Amino acid sequence: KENPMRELRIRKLCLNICVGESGDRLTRAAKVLEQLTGQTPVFSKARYTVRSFGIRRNEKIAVHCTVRGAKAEEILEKGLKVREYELRKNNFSDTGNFGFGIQEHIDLGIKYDPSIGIYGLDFYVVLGRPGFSIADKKRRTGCIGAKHRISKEEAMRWFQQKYDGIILPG
Amino acid sequence: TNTKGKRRGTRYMFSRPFRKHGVVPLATYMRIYKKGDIVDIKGMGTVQKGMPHKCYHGKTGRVYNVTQHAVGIVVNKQVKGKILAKRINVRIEHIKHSKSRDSFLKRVKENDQKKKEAKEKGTWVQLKRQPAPPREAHFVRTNGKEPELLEPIPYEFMA
Amino acid sequence: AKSKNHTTHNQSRKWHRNGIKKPRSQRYESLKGVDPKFLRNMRFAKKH
Amino acid sequence: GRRPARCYRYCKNKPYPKSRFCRGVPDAKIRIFDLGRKKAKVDEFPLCGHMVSDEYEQLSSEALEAARICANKYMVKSCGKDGFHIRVRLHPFHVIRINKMLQTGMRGAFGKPQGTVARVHIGQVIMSIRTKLQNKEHVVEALRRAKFKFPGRQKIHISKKWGFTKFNADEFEDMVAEKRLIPDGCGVKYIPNRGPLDKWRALHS
Amino acid sequence: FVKVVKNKAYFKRYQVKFRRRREGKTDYYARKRLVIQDKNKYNTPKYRMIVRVTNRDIICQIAYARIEGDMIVCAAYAHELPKYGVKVGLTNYAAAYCTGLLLARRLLNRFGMDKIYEGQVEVTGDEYNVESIDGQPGAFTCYLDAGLARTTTGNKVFGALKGAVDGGLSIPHSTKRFPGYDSESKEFNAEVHRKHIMGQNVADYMRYLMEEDEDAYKKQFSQYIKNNVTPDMMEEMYKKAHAAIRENPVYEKKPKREVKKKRWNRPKMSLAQKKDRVAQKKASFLRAQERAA
RNA sequence: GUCUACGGCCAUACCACCCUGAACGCGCCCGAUCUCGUCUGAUCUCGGAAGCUAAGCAGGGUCGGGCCUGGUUAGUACUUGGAUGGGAGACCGCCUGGGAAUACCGGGUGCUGUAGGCUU
RNA sequence: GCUCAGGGAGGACAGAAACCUCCCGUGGAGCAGAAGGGCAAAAGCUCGCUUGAUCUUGAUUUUCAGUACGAAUACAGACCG
RNA sequence: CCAGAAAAGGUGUUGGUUGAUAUAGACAGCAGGAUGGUGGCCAUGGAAGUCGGAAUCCGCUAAGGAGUGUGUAACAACUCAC
RNA sequence: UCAACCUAUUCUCAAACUUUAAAUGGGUAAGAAGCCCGGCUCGCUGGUGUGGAGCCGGGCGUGGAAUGCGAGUGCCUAGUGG
Ligand SMILES: [Mg+2]
Ligand SMILES: [Mg+2]
Ligand SMILES: [Mg+2]
Ligand SMILES: [Mg+2]
Ligand SMILES: [Mg+2]
Ligand SMILES: [Mg+2]
Ligand SMILES: [Mg+2]
Ligand SMILES: [Mg+2]
Ligand SMILES: [Mg+2]
Ligand SMILES: [Mg+2]
Ligand SMILES: [Mg+2]
Ligand SMILES: [Mg+2]
């Protein structure tokens, strides 16, 4: 049998574009994300200063955005039609989430524009389960037990079942 | 010479005990102190408002003044050859009832109770505590078997 | 020309020969340092 | 170089170790503490002799290494090169100080770190040698001729423990056959009746 | 590998927080500032009005703290509202107002101060504050306890606050958090607060979902259709409930049924059983190893 | 028997994994118009009740780790006072009183207050 | 309202180290400095508003002779946040 | 207190602990043997038991080490364990 | 394999380390200024003659551990501060 609240589902999908420098690159790396999502992304600041990468303390070097629900599933299937519905064994986290990255944004729907330029992007899929709100609600917070958490092979079978994805060994 | 700081040498004196760090429990707060309560002083490191000075940690005094958060108290502090009954303002965390008084209080009520009793009887009870007397005579029953013989054990350098 | 700096040697003998006299036990202790809006109340309760 | 060891002999000062506050301590010249065939099992060196101090004094880190070399050099002659195991069981930690004169005088007197010393309580094992039970007088003579490197007074005691363990010799093979303690090298591991039951199964399997 | 972080030394050095902090139910930093009495008040109680909003209920109860555990003096739950004629919609703002009102009027009934300090009979949603009448027993004051609720504008904890205030409690408050305080312009629309109290946020949404898609309307408001309440029944139902509460606020206790003494869980086994368990486990493992080998 | 709301003492209550949870609850859960707040109704806020013990939570289990309480170690270590005691010293023995702590071996695994339900 | 130091598993360029995400995490961080104490729905970090860093008389603590100054602790009367 | 000594030793002498061997005749002491493979292998200019490294057996035996020491260039000669 | 790393083990330590933790020691208490009733007052606090505090009036002596001993209180003051 099956109990329908341990049915496995996504709970968020997180995008970022880490351009590594501020200004006209980064402020258009946000404009491509709002073309993807239909919502304004958020600029992440640099935590430390490493002169080898060319960044300083509190520099806006990356732009990220989280999506939920049907819009998240839409962006996920667009990226998986880019990545040929094929991922790897090592792409999956130990805790059950997974993710990958796309090398240019013009493939998953975005028309090429010369003022925008070109940008690569990252996905990361946070698989949930109905019940994972216990970890972050305010009043009576708790951990989410041992049966209920997602292994890695449950994520592998979820991806091989939901989208008929090809997991290659590597 | 030594420094004359307010908190010199109290790294173990106002330190919290082991695994009793953190939030102050609230029954310390919810205990009312009236005038004339014999009361102990024990400073706490988690709060710093109203610290009694390190010469009062472990002293017992008498409440004379009660304010919103703190308590005035007359404690006896010894200055080189004399002993001053000096009054200090201590916030409510650093202070705790003396149980040296309530045993006397229950003994007063107990012996006034048994003085009201046995007054209509004419029975003269004893009310002064006498010290622990010498033990009276008593037969030790060597019931059956004999006392076991003990001998000094021979020395072996086990180290 | 150095000197002995600090000592508490004969001090305990000097204290006890007059004795460390405990403070004067006396009923009706004073009312200095009492909460002044409590002592306003006390003085109106006395004057009426 | 160094002043005579009758100066720095009695445990006069507080234990003043090499730490964050006392810096620049020169290294104690004993640095090998146990040697012989130290890579051995517990089953093949049962017998053990202890040099036990009988004075509360300080043994210098140089005298420790002198006595170690003197007790090693006898048993490489006697028991062969892999028939014993010396373990010196006093690591020196107390650094001792030196007020050297060049004319200031006694004013401003606190010594620089000179050397390291080992404070030894009454009845404490300084050195201990384990070997076969047939090499008993070799342990006795080796510890005897290593006594003369230390000051003070030492006795020689052959213990009832199986080697460098805290378990008695008449009970060691009994408890091994009962599988209550298992060998892991120089020593053993004691198994209580307290673990989870799969650890019981794994040793009885 | 990596060091085990939840080591035996970790559990030796580890200090727990308080039990209610571990369960999450209590904010002690707010609790100490709420509940402690000034020491010159000398065992005078300090009443607080605890509001806890649940998924299917609202707990409103008035409590003061003693040492062995804080006494509840009066309670009023949202599942007492079908007695007063609110069949359904028990977790919303109007039910929070009703149970605040019920808590207030029931406490006044306990203390014998019903006919004095009757408060707002006609609900308006203004600044209301109970002035204490001289020569009469003084008005009951207590302090609002929200626990862990994020106290933003329009909260049902402040709905229960307005319920107790209009019932006749002198709780200190201000109309920044009531629904209708416009944030950007800093005034307070008492008519908007009144229609939130009477439930036109729900009734207007009910008339909204009746328009475009009625199976979504039945998916949203199921037992509203089963209990025959409509947006034109809505406001009159809450006014009749307010009148019923302010008429008879006393509370009966349900008579206790005599227990069957049935043990619904599994009791704690003794040391003899759990030593015998591992004795026969070791016997079973040895007798299963000796034949399989 | 047990739960909820608020607690007291704050591990005999913690942590890991497994088993079972009748009824009422507590939850997970469904939504975003209104109150409110975010990149995102995930959190917070608001409106509900299609589904469900999967998780939270509760009860229990582990020759469980921890913790708590005892035994041993131990009248040992240390120690108040004393000797025209010993010992070249270091230090040690004795007289009079007090008296610890590991390792090792057992036992225990939340008690309880106010208010309200459920087991009709 | 948040949770830190660190670590494990992941994710285009990206690496030992830039950013995103999950999990462990009794403090191993941070609180201007020296050290010590103290602190986790805070005393830390981030936001909103601010001037209790204000006017004023007494008492008390600390060093102490039971004197000052400095510093601090309870109150009380105003004006405020 | 306090006015002078230690590590280390002694077959001086007195106690004390522990382990051996001894009428199947020991400890001394005086006498008789102390052999063969074999001058065992490596090595060394020469090492025959005797400067060196590992082995260390057998036979005949009442008993004798591939040797305890003195010797020799190496033996021889003497001595000891037994 | 050599190592670092990780897991149980192990030898030795601390004045400026510490879970435990003595002996000696430091406060306070061992009644009449204390208890037990009744009634006032208060501009303080107050759901409530609630709370607290101060007043009046009344009743309680087996003087509430051992031992020992007269105690309190105020002026002036030398010398001393190697
Ligand atoms: Mg002088
Ligand atoms: Mg010389
Ligand atoms: Mg010294
Ligand atoms: Mg708060
Ligand atoms: Mg939702
Ligand atoms: Mg469940
Ligand atoms: Mg379950
Ligand atoms: Mg256990
Ligand atoms: Mg209960
Ligand atoms: Mg039935
Ligand atoms: Mg805060
Ligand atoms: Mg600050």
mmCIF file of N, CA, C and O (backbone and C1' of nucleotides) and ligand atoms in Angstrom, chain E residues 29, chain G residues 1-2 41-43, ligand 11:
data_model
loop_
_atom_site.group_PDB
_atom_site.id
_atom_site.type_symbol
_atom_site.label_atom_id
_atom_site.label_comp_id
_atom_site.label_asym_id
_atom_site.label_seq_id
_atom_site.Cartn_x
_atom_site.Cartn_y
_atom_site.Cartn_z
ATOM 1 N N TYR E 29 11.705 34.717 27.412
ATOM 2 C CA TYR E 29 12.129 36.110 27.421
ATOM 3 C C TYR E 29 10.929 37.042 27.438
ATOM 4 O O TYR E 29 10.924 38.040 28.156
ATOM 5 P P G G 1 9.075 37.811 16.607
ATOM 6 O "O5'" G G 1 9.960 37.485 15.327
ATOM 7 C "C5'" G G 1 9.389 37.526 14.031
ATOM 8 C "C4'" G G 1 10.447 37.589 12.964
ATOM 9 C "C3'" G G 1 11.477 36.487 13.013
ATOM 10 O "O3'" G G 1 10.992 35.298 12.431
ATOM 11 C "C1'" G G 1 12.559 38.560 12.710
ATOM 12 P P C G 2 11.680 33.900 12.777
ATOM 13 O "O5'" C G 2 12.879 33.830 11.740
ATOM 14 C "C5'" C G 2 14.052 33.098 12.027
ATOM 15 C "C4'" C G 2 15.277 33.863 11.615
ATOM 16 C "C3'" C G 2 16.588 33.261 12.066
ATOM 17 O "O3'" C G 2 17.046 32.264 11.180
ATOM 18 C "C1'" C G 2 16.563 35.571 12.564
ATOM 19 P P A G 41 16.541 30.996 22.663
ATOM 20 O "O5'" A G 41 15.991 32.353 22.041
ATOM 21 C "C5'" A G 41 16.340 32.747 20.726
ATOM 22 C "C4'" A G 41 15.140 33.235 19.961
ATOM 23 C "C3'" A G 41 14.284 34.271 20.668
ATOM 24 O "O3'" A G 41 14.766 35.586 20.468
ATOM 25 C "C1'" A G 41 12.914 32.559 19.764
ATOM 26 P P A G 42 14.869 36.616 21.690
ATOM 27 O "O5'" A G 42 16.208 36.195 22.427
ATOM 28 C "C5'" A G 42 16.276 36.162 23.844
ATOM 29 C "C4'" A G 42 17.591 36.685 24.373
ATOM 30 C "C3'" A G 42 17.939 38.123 23.990
ATOM 31 O "O3'" A G 42 18.623 38.723 25.087
ATOM 32 C "C1'" A G 42 19.661 36.688 23.287
ATOM 33 P P A G 43 18.710 40.317 25.225
ATOM 34 O "O5'" A G 43 20.242 40.616 24.931
ATOM 35 C "C5'" A G 43 20.660 41.734 24.155
ATOM 36 C "C4'" A G 43 22.164 41.881 24.162
ATOM 37 C "C3'" A G 43 22.919 41.026 23.155
ATOM 38 O "O3'" A G 43 24.112 41.696 22.765
ATOM 39 C "C1'" A G 43 23.513 40.374 25.356
HETATM 40 MG MG MG J 11 15.106 40.067 21.037
#
